[PDB]
């Protein structure tokens, strides 16, 4: 089933700040905002953790779209291959979640990768979930849904139950 990260990195405060630093032309900004909020709450409802959106400066979870190299050692690779990636909880790059601008992202109303699904996966890694061996899990390593029992068991193992 579920994986964490080695030595169970996790947010050490009850409040975790997040910021959407860069948007996609594929979607209205407010749509990315609402879907990120929905993704975070799918995890947050299970655990004693609150998310706070900020619109400036450096939040704990920095979220954004980028093409090619974007300041970490994991440059994006244009259309196809890698779609997105995210970092275990920690300072700086830890918690951050990046989406490749060279794909197409949808709110469900158009053609594209489902951004809610993808953001729930990435933000799982942003909270300290690794990949699951359970094909029903949002944290399964490969790409209308809910967290699986495995997803919920894993996140509650790391943070405890709300």
């Amino acid at each position: 089933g579920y994986s964490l990260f080695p030595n169970s990195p996790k947010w050490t405060s009850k409040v975790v700040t997040y910021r959407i630093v860069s948007y996609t032309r594929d979607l209205p900004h407010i749509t990315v905002d609402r879907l990120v909020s929905k993704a975070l709450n799918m995890w947050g409802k299970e655990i004693p953790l609150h998310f706070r959106k900020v619109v400036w400066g450096t939040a704990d979870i920095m979220i954004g779209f980028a093409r090619g190299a974007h300041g970490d050692s994991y440059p994006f690779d244009g259309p196809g291959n890698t779609l997105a990636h995210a970092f275990a909880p920690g300072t700086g790059l830890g918690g951050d979640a990046h989406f490749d601008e060279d794909e197409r992202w949808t709110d469900g109303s158009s053609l594209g990768i489902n951004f809610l699904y993808a953001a729930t996966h990435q933000l799982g890694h942003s909270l300290g979930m690794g990949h699951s061996s359970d094909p029903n899990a949002v944290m399964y390593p490969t790409y209308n849904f809910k967290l699986s029992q495995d997803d919920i068991k894993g996140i509650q193992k790391l943070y405890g139950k709300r």
Binding site: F5, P9, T82, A84, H85, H125, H131
Partner: peptide, 5 residues
């Protein structure tokens, strides 16, 4: 992709 760092 989930990375450490």
């Amino acid at each position: 992709x989930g990375f450490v760092x």
